[PDB]
Design a protein around this ligand. Sequence first.
Ligand SMILES: Cc1ccc2cc1-c1cc(nc(N)n1)Sc1cccc(c1)OCCCCO2
Length: 215
Amino acid sequence: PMEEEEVETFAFQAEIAQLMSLIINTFYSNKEIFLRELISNSSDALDKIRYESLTDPSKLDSGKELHINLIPNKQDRTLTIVDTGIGMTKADLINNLGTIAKSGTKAFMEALQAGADISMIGQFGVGFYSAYLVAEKVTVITKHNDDEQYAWESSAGGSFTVRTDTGEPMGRGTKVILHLKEDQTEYLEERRIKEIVKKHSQFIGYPITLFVEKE
Ligand SMILES: Cc1ccc2cc1-c1cc(nc(N)n1)Sc1cccc(c1)OCCCCO2
C-alpha cells in the first residue's frame, strides 16, 4: 500500500547560498581538496564518539568500530564517504548544514574573490561546501544515538530538504553521498582516490578502507 513521508524544505542562510553559488559557478584548479574536507569532518566525528565513550561506554552499543569507508560507484556516478562517528541529531543537521550563519563565510568569499586557492576553505569552517566543486547533488544520511536516522539533500539553488530516513539503517554515524558532475568522474578511480588520500589525508587517526567494485 501507499506510504506517506513528511519532508521539510529549507532555505540556506543568505551567505551560505552565496558561497555555494560561488563554488559551483567559478573555476577552481585544485578541486581534489573536497575529499580532505569530508575525511576531516569524519575524523572529528570519530573523535567525538571516542571521547563520549570514555564516560558512557553504552554509546558504542550502536557499533564499536571507529572507521571511515570510501565507496566509489562508476555505475551511478556516486562517491560515498561513510564514518561510524557521533552522527547528527535533527538540531545538529539543520544547524550545521545550512540554516545558521558561519563566521568564516564572508571572509572566505572575499578571499576567493582576491585569488585564494580553494584549499583555504577548511580554515574558514565551511569545508563541507567544497563537496559542490565536484558534486551536482549531495545527500547526507546521519544517525546519532537516541535519535532517528535523517536524510538531508541539496542540489544547491538555495534550498535543501530534511526527512526521517526510511532507507537502509546505519548503526551510528554519517554517510555523505556525492552525485558527481559529468566532468568529475576521475574521483571514482581507485588510483586517483589513493593519490588524494596519500597527499591530503595521511595523518588521520582512524582506519580508512577503499571499496572497489570488480570491473
Ligand atoms: C556533513 C557535515 C557538514 C558540516 C559540518 C559537519 C558535518 C558532519 C558532521 C558529522 N559527521 C560528519 N561526517 N560530517 S557529526 C557532527 C555532529 C555534531 C557537530 C559536528 C559534527 O560538528 C560541529 C562543527 C561543524 C561541522 O560542520
